Amino acid sequence: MLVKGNEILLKAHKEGYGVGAFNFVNFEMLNAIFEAGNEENSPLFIQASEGAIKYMGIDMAVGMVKIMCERYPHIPVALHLDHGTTFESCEKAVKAGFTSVMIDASHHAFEENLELTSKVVKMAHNAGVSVEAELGRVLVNPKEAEQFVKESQVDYLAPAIGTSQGAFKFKGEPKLDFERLQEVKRLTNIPLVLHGASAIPDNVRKSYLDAGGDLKGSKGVPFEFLQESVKGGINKVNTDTDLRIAFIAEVRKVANEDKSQFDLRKFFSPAQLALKNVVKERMKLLGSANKI
Amino acid sequence: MLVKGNEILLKAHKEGYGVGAFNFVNFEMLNAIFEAGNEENSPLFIQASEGAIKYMGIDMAVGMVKIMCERYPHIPVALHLDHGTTFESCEKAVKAGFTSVMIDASHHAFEENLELTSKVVKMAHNAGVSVEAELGRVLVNPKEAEQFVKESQVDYLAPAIGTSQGAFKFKGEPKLDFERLQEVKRLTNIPLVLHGASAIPDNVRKSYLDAGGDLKGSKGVPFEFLQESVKGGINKVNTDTDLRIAFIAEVRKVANEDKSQFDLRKFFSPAQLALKNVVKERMKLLGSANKI
Ligand code: NA
Ligand code: NA
Ligand SMILES: [Zn+2]
Ligand SMILES: [Zn+2]
Ligand SMILES: [Zn+2]
Ligand SMILES: [Zn+2]
């Protein structure tokens, strides 16, 4: 059941748990994500960045997801455009079959962000698609978020509270503005989204370095911070970097330990398993396990 | 378009060229194979082994190919079950949407090979699907191939004339029994198939070794032997190993040269390019280029 994103996140919002939003760029990532949701009895947010869409072609992005949905028809799945940069990108996703779209205009001033988001909302809602937007870069102004949500009719909001994409989130100590998060939640009363929510667990780090990799003083969000975010009102947790490190760690490993290995399945089967286990543990941490 | 295997190979049979049959196991391989055919204006034989089908799941194997065919509707495409081992496996491929199936019973005596092949043919032909079979392991008996084709009504035949799967084809010197090939072709007058037809070209071996890989003194079929096979009557040229070596060569290269790289596209975009170039060259070598 491919469903509009709001169907999944309104439930998480009402019941106070978080739904991981897991990026993919090919079949091995998608397969591992679905198997995780199947084994944890967890709803799924599947995300594709504009770059991943260009890599796969939007027809294959939607095509593979729809195939996976028929394979696991009992799992609620939303297919979400991650960090859409233009109205036209969001519209193309809508037409291709995406059930959720994010328009990121947090770099514009409030008035232009609200205007562009409202335009996307009008377009997507007319097609039965949910919309995500972003406020803050500079942390979110809770009073701006209140008006933004009322004016735009956006389904969920990503408030900046101290996170950032990538493996290098903090060059000092991890800190998130939970008081700010709670204020936004109180004033907006909608599902909230956490961007840059990869944690880089110790076991995933160990596997990557044990394979000769280098994470350049990386630092992710601690598990207790993710747990505190969900308590504060986060319901969608964007997760990408964790999946990639776990995956490539195993590819590096196979390459190192057998120089005559060129069967793709021998590289990517252990890579899928490692990615899947990250997703499974994240679903348990966030509280979406056993929610189907 | 997605068409019966015989539609492609009968044309190649009557015109005297070879159509590469390229194996895939995931989206990256399929995409690079398709881009190769689009750029050479070549018909495509897309192959999936039973192992590949188990890895992808047959619904995804077919689903991805149909997406690709709609992306390049001008390219004749057959989707082929490579080395089917049971009737039931061939039957599942037929039901899933394969347009060509191979039943490999060449390890049985003639009567048992003929019986199992005839059963598959009856089922596949009833569903508008073409069938490949195999004779020889001792090399093919041409008079036996004659009666095998006449009795079974199989669409194309793989006669054993010296090749073998994998990168360890020739422990000594490459040698194919072209006289035996010509006799089979004279007596059967159908499209013929060459198994284990990877060449392991110099540039691909160079790339793999430079990436720290070990090929273990591998030896493929020389380009001259492949062209002579086509002249002798080979119309379908099974090619797998060359694609995987070229692909994994690039993967190994990205891992060696940047230990902090875990973006999957940075690994597989060059891998796709290398695989695509092998295919394009093979299409030109075999004579399928510019045949659409
Ligand atoms: Na997003
Ligand atoms: Na075959
Ligand atoms: Zn983000
Ligand atoms: Zn963001
Ligand atoms: Zn073979
Ligand atoms: Zn064979």
UniProtKB/Swiss-Prot annotation, chains A, B:
Residues holding Zn(2+) 1: 83, 165, 195
Its EC number(s): 4.1.2.13
The protein's matches in InterPro entries, at most eight in alphabetical order, are given as: Aldolase_TIM, Class_II_FBP_aldolase, FBA_II, Fruc_bis_ald_class-2
Pathway noted in the entry: Carbohydrate degradation; glycolysis; D-glyceraldehyde 3-phosphate and glycerone phosphate from D-glucose: step 4/4
List of catalytic residues: 82 (proton donor)
Residue ranges that the Swiss-Prot or TrEMBL entry lists as coiled coil = none
Q: Which protein is depicted?
A: Fructose-bisphosphate aldolase
The scientific name of the source species is Helicobacter pylori (strain ATCC 700392 / 26695)
